[PDB]
């Protein structure tokens, strides 16, 4: 009765590239086939445009202000329930292959098994410090060297990572298929979390070649000069060391080309996973979700990467396909915060069991024609912020607030590229009432003073602790997968014939000319 | 310049047994000689009368309301600085041998090396539930079978543990001595944390025999009937399943006898540590601390173990000896909360570096004759509480508050056994104004409604997660001491003569 | 400098299926391409028709009587030099992905790194016992259930293993390519050792479908009844529990069809390795060997699997390709015993440094047109033998001796299918004199009484020890691969940009130190 759940997650995928499933110009036949049978959430947003905050929030269905994972080095408490816990409590086998950027000594956070280590660190090294506004840390900050460095390679740090993530996810699916004839097996939930299309913007030749004739290599909004940028965008450019890189038109085109090429790299791995589900005969009983942690400005407005609430950074794709999911396109804004309650709903878990632990809403009713009215909230409190920023997405509007900056208000229906800041330049009385309305809702959801103080305390505490932990012998927190070789394959407490039968799936099949095995 | 630091910690040691170092009737020659040499804090209290809360608070110098380690299964966040971090940041090698009842995947919390696993669990299993007031969990709650089951054995779970804690601590001291002649060495801080004299009250014959003629086998206050007990004591007796145990006078004597015997068992281990320091020539450069996480009523008032603020449960000894420490007896109340700022002060760390992270005060000024006026605060929010309790200890007074119970106010100078509740029976207008003053102080320090809400959220959260974590394959968080065999002793990337010389200490010695 | 060496090994591959590279009827485009550019040894033999003895002898270039690895449970001493030692001593990084059926607590035998555990046991469980002739051990002996159970499945024990073997082999090549521009790098030798096409004869549907119209699904020589079999064949059929299986023609076809399908399964993995070598720019400096431990009778004569000296069981392919290797087909008999001295010769190691440690001869002279006259020797002393057997292969002749059985003498020129035993039915005085000459050679090479005594002592010794080791807590010897997660990918003792550059290969436009092609 309970469906299997395959979560396919990718990193830094601009949601505007999924207008209705993948954009037509992308070479993504597998993701395009998946989308045609999916509920597709067009205006879907991350909870925070940064990896560890987005992913802790994604796992728990809680905003960063609640998980306390403010930045890429903030400890994620083991006691915070995640969709892994909820599903595991409900009888699921739960596994992760790939990245989740969990910081702290808990590298599972409810997952029963984790098949790879993380690509990124698990310690407090990347802790920002609001006491030194304007500083940058060159050994890990984003810099525009990813833009000037884009190109072609046959292996990279990330391609090693994702190649392994995919192999072990498919291996696990093959292993799980051996139970497929047991009606009393546990349903499974496998999260497969790739690091592409995150930079470096570097792609295998095969996929780079797919985009030789690409007509989407120019961003839709050109570079805004530093002196004309809004303050947060200015902070982002300084954090990227913009003044020490000469980003040419060609650099922009090459970066976008490798990025699209790495989507096609991912599409092939999506196809592998679907193929494994199909041939092992678990496709029809498996829900498939496609999601990402945050987007990438990809040169739009002159900006790259994330760390802001503009569409290209804050929007991320979201699709759900499988049993009991009617395909279609949904335009109401939604959030990564809705994924954990949606997963619980699809798993048969009652609303009361998840209500105290989740800040979002289930999307299943929406899949079934029921309007969703809840606004979308977002937060940011890491590098290139000197104080926290919050945003609200509701109806056609986006509102952004930072105690240090002028407000931003965008009418995304009329101004999808967010070129006109209606808080600075209100069109009339309705714009003014709308700003008051969003100010009141902002004040209702966030105490920005308490938010700042909480972030400063978290940073300061971690810097004392991390300074200590980097003296003397280092104790690493990186997850080490363990697959006991002494229990695998054939060992001499076993019966070879029984082993071979148990590891074969499907079983008892095979006919040359006499079609009964 | 920076001294070495040896912290010796024991578990469940009633502080009333250290009036001026160990009480006369205890066979504790090694701890008595240490005490003559130490600043001794007579009226020292734990921050919380329970293992994990007291220990998380002890390491951080923060109360449970700040660490959020409310009970024996509450997660201790890795990001909370401890004295291990403070000393490590300042250039110390830091190590732990033995118990600290850290809950969560971090089993070091700043310690650079940990030589043993913990005796107790590292996961959320022992999480209380304020939604079910009155329940008890038989498979891990205290029960008076410790009292009826006291006796003599040559090995126990705890004796295996402590024998190993002791061996590895002395081994580590020996290993450290090999750097003692190196001017570029780091100073070291070794915490040696024993589980005795925590129950089961079971002792080796050798130490049991020391107390054949002991005159302290009867508690000073007898069993108070359930009807006549204060509400919290009633909760504790119910949690101990008291209705199903017939505790006789013999049981009480046998339990106390084994407890004293296990203090003597520890005293021999204290002697071993000091002997190693002496023969390795590290004694004179080493501060030595003696401390405990909480006490044990030991049958006084009819109660056993801890979980309350009465003297026998809330008082724990505290002594400090070594370079720059004037010996003496101090009567002003102190707290385990003061240990971390004291350690930092002794180690040369500035007050500013530790002020944002510690709720207590350094005891070094007191050691040097400066009056200390800060009150001592305590908290409890675990088994046998249905709502959090707080306590204030200041001057001659102890005040205890729980939203569910009548207040308690004791004048410990006039009523050292806390037999007269002056909140209930004021002696006069000074007692009345004193109660009002402590009420005002409590309200200024604690939002008790927020406290209860925070504890309930922590409990609920953990029960969701722990139920999940006990489905399928279990991933344990217990500490596994580091594996290092390929780098130990003689291996063929090394020169044998160089090895022998480096591992020999003292060096160049001998006299025929 | 010295060349890289990729050793592609497969298990239980009947050498008659590679008459000149792969037979025409096989779907094996990658191995046929490889064969076209290789020196191909048509009449190449295993040293012992069984996995562990063949593989210990292969690694050492020593016969079983010298390695003392007589059977699948015999300890292989760590002190015995292997091609891994020889190459590693000469400056090579050496690695193994996959199977080598090493028995004993040493699971590396000179390999610097092993990327997978073994599919098979590493302890003394499978020790035969000459004190009980006629017994069989049902929980691990071969049985004709492989033939009756042949068919189609998408995962098996062996495809899980070989999928993993392949993935990690290709990953290791990618990792090694990152050193390819460093002139201080070590040359590398990677052995990729697959368990297919060993039974179970079970194949993925994709590859099974390739052999729908196959014309080779029935053996040329059909089943010989027990009462007309030679004694050793009779012992093999009894060991296979042949009396309890009804092997139909359809069963024979299904088994051969799956077997061929698994050759095609392996051919796709060969193409994968070649593709990785090509795109990493490592192909042109890489010697590629293709080899197998023993063959598979595949129903010929009514026999299945190995354990004998007939062509289908004793012949295994051998090809060598790469720098300095002239392609060609060689008909002089060779042996797996020659691989280790050939590898050393090709790696630039002098003959004097390997001569005291190998029984075989380098094939490099033969590749360069020098005649080879050394005979090919083989030994067997495991299951289905009640006493050791030896064989001599020289010129057109094969001679087989066992103290318990009539001699066999075959003229492979006139009788390629070994249907006429010329020791029993000589054609004339030349056949008679040839038998005497092989008798004298046999007596000069082997003391068969001593051989039997040595195998009996080895068996008895292991059974005493194994009986003890299976009491109480078991201590496994299985190899546990370890890739330390605390040193992989991004960790906060590193600079992220330095990391990315080091892990990117090839290093072209956009990389730190590429200024031109
Ligand atoms: C991804 N970086 C590590 C480059 C910066 C944090 O987003
Ligand atoms: C586990 N016990 C409850 C028995 C002791 C800790 O309080
Ligand atoms: C391969 N078996 C394990 C089936 C028997 C030994 O060759
Ligand atoms: Ca990310
Ligand atoms: Ca305790
Ligand atoms: Ca084999």
Author numbering:
A (entry chain C), C (entry chain A): 4 to 520
B (entry chain B): 4 to 515
Give me lines lifted from the publication on this model:
Choline-O-sulfatase (COSe; EC 3.1.6.6) is a member of the alkaline phosphatase (AP) superfamily, and its natural function is to hydrolyze choline-O-sulfate into choline and sulfate. DLS experiments performed at pH 8.0 show a single peak in the particle-size distribution by intensity, with a hydrodynamic radius of 5.7 ± 2.1 nm, which corresponds to a globular protein size of 200 kDa, also supporting a tetrameric quaternary arrangement.
The extra densities are not present in the C54S mutant structure, further supporting this PTM. Choline is placed at the bottom of the ‘aromatic tunnel’ both in the WT and the C54S mutant structures. The hydroxyl moiety of choline in this structure is 3.0–3.5 Å from Lys309, but also makes various water-mediated interactions with Glu386, Asn75 and the peptide bond of Ser54. Asp386 further occupied different positions in the C54S mutant structure. FGly needs then to be hydrated to a geminal diol, it being accepted that a water molecule reconstitutes the FGly diol after substrate hydrolysis. Our choline-bound C54S SmeCOSe structure shows a water molecule at a binding distance from the cation and Ser54, in approximately the same position at which the germinal diol of FGly appears in the WT structure; this water molecule is also at a binding distance from His201 and Lys309.
